[PDB]
Design a protein around this ligand. Structure first.
Ligand SMILES: [Mg+2]
Ligand SMILES: [Mg+2]
Ligand SMILES: [Mg+2]
Lengths: 144, 154, 180, 221
RNA sequence: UCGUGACAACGACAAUGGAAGUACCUUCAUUUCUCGGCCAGACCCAACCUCGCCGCGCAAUUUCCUUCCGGGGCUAACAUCCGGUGGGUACUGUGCGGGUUUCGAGGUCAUGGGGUGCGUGAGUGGGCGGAAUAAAGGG
RNA sequence: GGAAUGAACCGCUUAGGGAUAUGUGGCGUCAAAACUUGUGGGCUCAUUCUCGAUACGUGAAAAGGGUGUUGGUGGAUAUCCACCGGCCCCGA
RNA sequence: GUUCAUAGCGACGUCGCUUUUUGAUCCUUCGAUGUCGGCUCUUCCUAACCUAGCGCCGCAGAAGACGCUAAGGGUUGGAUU
RNA sequence: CGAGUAAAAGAUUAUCCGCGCAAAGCGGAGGCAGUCCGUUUUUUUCUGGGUCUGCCGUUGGGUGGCAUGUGCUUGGCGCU
RNA sequence: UCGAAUCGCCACUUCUCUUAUCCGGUGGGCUGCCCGCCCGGCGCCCAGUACCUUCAUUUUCACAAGAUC
């Protein structure tokens, strides 16, 4: 039912339990440089929605004055397709080729009083399959 | 039951106003949910109206009468040295610490990060060598069980 | 609204009263009693040196202020129960058919009430002691318990389908008196 | 759920052992039913996975007689020509919470159906949820910030009993068993908690003299 | 209207329809290939639109403030309140301002540019050049 | 474009499109907006067709009662009487 | 109503509810919605005749009047038409 | 390929079983050689004898139980 | 076979109860003041505050060109 013999397993555990000290997990890998947001939906009223503008809720803002810090920042939505298509640095960096794709946009102005922002996604509009999914809010361009 | 009572001469701290986290002494009571607050030993904090939903009573009290003069209140506060005692309280130090973190300049934030890491390392070193003698952790306790179990067969 | 409404009752010596989160315990020579007052929302305190029990309501209307006296009455009754106890006496009033009552430990049987073959049965709670003398006597520490057993006994026997002015047969309570 | 041989074989080739999605566990004891449902429903639409426990401790404003009558009025509604097609009257407290949340979602689109799929709604704290992590509460619906003290309120479990629920004794028997096991375990490891506390103390006087001052300035030492 | 091969998928909202994207298909059209009518990012000029910070005028700040008394009131007093005495010299209103011998910033995927570089492709500027140094107009 | 729904009510009146700001109506979820705003006052508890809550909309209610609770007015005595409102309850 | 307004009733007045009668209207249907009664069969309402539980009487017993909660169950066979 | 058990409880479920409260503590475990693998702690496997407790399939013969044509249990043969 | 979206984790959190309640518990003195007593953590670039130590031409943003599963 198990692997190895009863011997050389009792000795293995004794050797592992000794020499053991207090060691913790340290995050020394590549860092994250963006804030996490969610796509609430599109601007709308009781008559219907208008898909040329999107509403994004960011973590730890909860205030209009905090949302004003993020006006002009760049925003992207990350998803995957079903084969490898062309990408930036397709020939200079072949390791980048993947099914991953990104749709970019910018933050125009705050929405409401609770820290929601308005986003315009370049020329086109974001697909409706992104509603409820992760949105990346980067720290550039920076005024600070 | 165990609440501090609202009365003339009771120190309070403001909750959500423009003068947030500031201390002053109640000087009078008008109706059920309004008082007059004043603190003559601190900038701003002149006599003003304050809702009773915006204050929290403290443990310190000063013997004064209702509608007392500003010079009388100033004399009473310095005689009892009540303001100094509040500054020594743990609740005041926690509030002062949070204000210091909000003003940090990303270099003192690094210095605090170094200080916390140094303490965490030394705590780990202290915890060990008290686990070798009188074992307490999950692994060191199981080591005794393993060694005794293997004594008979080996 | 009133800023404060208060009242107090004095309890004698050799009796200990304690309160903890609107739960009152009173100790005496005949035992201890406990009452749950978590449904009242009042401010209870005891002095333990002046021997007084105080209840305060702070910002209340008429409905909120009317529970101060009700709470104080209950604590007074508990003190009067843990010392000198309570005792009730009931009487059997039969005109023609002599009704019979039998007490077997904690069980009571009533027979021959108004010429009926049905046997009425009642089980008395443990905290209330019952014994027979034409006199049925119930005694205990809790006035509320003792009074409720007498009420159950009286309601067991009633006249049905007959003029209640002409027919006046039943069980009635005569004397309320402390044990000592 | 129930990984087939296709799933186990793929995990064997790839080398994967276990995976756990990000889930929030909410303790629903002493929570207003309507206010908690409204807060949770909006969070579901925002792409969150939520498990709620102790659904029998939810509270409703009013007396038990008033709320029991309200349910009996709901139970009276049924399709006269074929009651097996009519509205369904669930009886367990956890099913009542899910029905309340469902009425606060767009339930006739794929977006709302997917959101409702992300809620679990247990009764009590089951064995597979005990050791996952710390539970959370919703301060906006905690019923000690919501109800005036003198107003009567209903406990959902008591009301769900007397209208058809028949597992109240099972739930309370399992809950009492959990308390004893959790209480015994928590009293254990008091030595290691004290040892760690006695390690952070006396760590000072071993650190360099400058890092202790920085700790004191920020109110951490 | 039907058969066959290939493919696309699709629960139950009868289908069809509108708008806006996306995933796969394109025997379609146009452009480019050592400069490109391709995709992004930042910068400049003009225009428009915002935010910070600093102020002004008016009797608006006297039905008011402060002292010393006589009533009155509470508790030993003080205070709330009413009459007098001498001093007076952040404040619940209303109409407005502020970058060029310079008051600090932001945005335009919501605008036009040759983006100072050739010729008739007309920088009009308190802002670009040249001169001069309190020049007239206020407290 | 609003009043869930409605020829006629409210707002507004219409070439094809962006940015900004409004009207009527709104800001617990459905459903955009106070992530349940105020460092604003009071009143109300409604047990079986189930308290109340967007005018037009009689798209449902009367006479008559109730110290249930919260306010006024006019008289005696240091609490009593008479009368009139608000919300809730019976009449239903 | 032995005296007794209100056990039970209640004139002269006045306030309502229902749509199970008959009127009033003329909105839908005249390139058609099969027009009375009975037979058969299911379901709903309560303004309660019987069955359950209570209060009250001008309720001694028996037999009844009135009122409340109650629609779970029941409510017949025939002569003439 | 988009992973949530009203399941267990540990070298991150791996590296053995039994009693015990997610305790204190208390019990059991067969040795040798080869091949192919092997960055370690009696490394990970595959065979051959190697002596076997517990087993499957047998032989009859003596019992014995069940409701009595069909299965078992005791007592020896060799045997996997 | 699979190129994929997601980007904290912990045998110190992963027990319970109250909110008219000593909010860490807990006594005393004279109906509110005064006086005593005892006891989340890590993680963010030397395994640790200290000397030492390779980062490139991927030479100005682009899914982290890296991880987890
Ligand atoms: Mg919303
Ligand atoms: Mg026809
Ligand atoms: Mg027909």
């Amino acid at each position: 039912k198990f692997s190895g013999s009863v011997a050389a397993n009792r000795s293995k555990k004794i050797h592992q339990l000794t020499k053991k000290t207090t060691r913790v997990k340290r995050d020394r890998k590549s860092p994250r440089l963006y804030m996490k947001g969610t796509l609430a939906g599109y601007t709308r009223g009781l008559h219907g929605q208008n898909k040329n503008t999107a509403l994004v809720r960011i973590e730890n803002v909860n205030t209009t004055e905090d949302a004003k810090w993020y006006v002009g920042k760049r925003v992207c939505y990350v998803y995957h397709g079903y084969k490898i298509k062309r990408c930036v640095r397709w020939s200079k960096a072949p390791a980048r080729r993947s099914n991953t794709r990104a749709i970019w946009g910018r933050i125009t102005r705050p929405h409401g009083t609770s820290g929601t922002v308005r986003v315009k996604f370049n020329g086109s509009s974001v697909p409706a399959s992104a509603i409820g999914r992760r949105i990346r809010v980067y720290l550039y361009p920076s005024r600070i | 039951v165990k609440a501090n009572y609202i009365r003339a001469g009771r120190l309070v701290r403001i909750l959500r106003g423009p003068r947030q986290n500031r201390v002053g002494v109640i000087v009078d009571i008008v109706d059920a949910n309004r008082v007059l607050v004043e603190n003559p030993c601190e900038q701003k904090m002149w006599r003003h109206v304050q809702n009773l939903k915006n204050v929290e009573p403290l443990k310190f009290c000063v013997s004064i009468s209702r509608n007392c003069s500003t010079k009388a209140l100033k004399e009473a506060l310095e005689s009892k040295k009540v303001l100094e005692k509040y500054a020594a309280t743990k609740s005041a130090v926690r509030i002062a610490a949070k204000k210091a973190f909000a003003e940090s300049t990303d270099f003192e934030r690094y210095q605090l990060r170094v200080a916390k890491r140094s303490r965490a390392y030394w705590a780990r070193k202290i915890f060990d060598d008290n686990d070798k003698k009188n074992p307490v952790s999950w692994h060191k306790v199981a080591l005794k069980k393993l060694l005794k179990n293997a004594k008979k067969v080996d | 609204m009133k800023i404060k409404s208060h009242d107090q009752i004095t309890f004698p010596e050799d009796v200990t009263v304690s309160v903890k989160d609107r739960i009152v315990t009173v100790k005496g020579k005949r035992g201890t009693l406990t009452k749950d007052l978590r449904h009242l929302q009042l401010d209870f305190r005891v002095n333990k040196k002046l021997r007084t029990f105080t209840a305060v309501r702070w910002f209340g209307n008429k409905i909120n202020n009317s529970t101060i006296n009700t709470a104080l009455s209950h604590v007074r009754n508990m003190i009067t129960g843990v010392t000198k106890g309570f005792r009730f006496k009931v009487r059997f009033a039969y005109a023609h058919f002599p009704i019979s009552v039998t007490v077997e430990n904690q069980l009571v049987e009533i027979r021959n009430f108004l010429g009926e073959k049905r046997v009425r049965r009642q089980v008395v709670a443990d905290d209330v002691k019952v014994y027979r003398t034409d006199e049925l006597v119930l005694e205990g520490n809790d006035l509320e318990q003792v009074s409720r057993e007498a009420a159950v006994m009286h309601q067991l026997c009633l006249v049905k389908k007959k003029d209640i002015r002409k027919f006046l047969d039943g069980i009635y309570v005569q004397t309320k008196t402390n044990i000592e | 759920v129930l990984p087939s041989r296709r799933s186990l074989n793929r995990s064997s080739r790839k080398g994967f052992k276990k995976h756990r999605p990000d889930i929030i566990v909410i303790d629903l004891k002493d929570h207003v039913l309507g206010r908690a449902a409204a807060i949770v429903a909006k969070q579901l639409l925002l792409g969150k996975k939520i498990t709620v426990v102790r659904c029998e401790k939810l509270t409703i404003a009013g007396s038990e007689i008033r709320n029991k009558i309200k349910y009996l009025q709901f139970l009276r509604k049924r399709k006269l020509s074929n009651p097996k097609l009519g509205p369904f009257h669930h009886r367990s407290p956890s099913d009542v919470f899910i029905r309340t949340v469902r009425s606060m979602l767009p339930r006739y689109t794929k977006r709302g159906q997917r959101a409702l799929r992300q809620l679990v709604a247990y009764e009590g704290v089951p064995v597979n949820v005990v050791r996952t992590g710390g539970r959370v509460v919703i301060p906006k619906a905690q019923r000690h910030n919501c109800y005036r003290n003198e107003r009567r309120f209903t406990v959902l479990g008591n009301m769900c009993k007397h209208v058809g629920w028949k597992y109240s004794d099972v739930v309370e028997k399992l809950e009492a068993a959990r308390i004893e096991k959790s209480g015994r375990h928590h009293k254990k490891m008091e030595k290691v908690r004290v040892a760690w506390k006695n390690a952070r103390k006396e760590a000072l006087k071993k650190m360099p003299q400058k890092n202790v001052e920085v700790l004191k300035k920020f109110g951490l030492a």
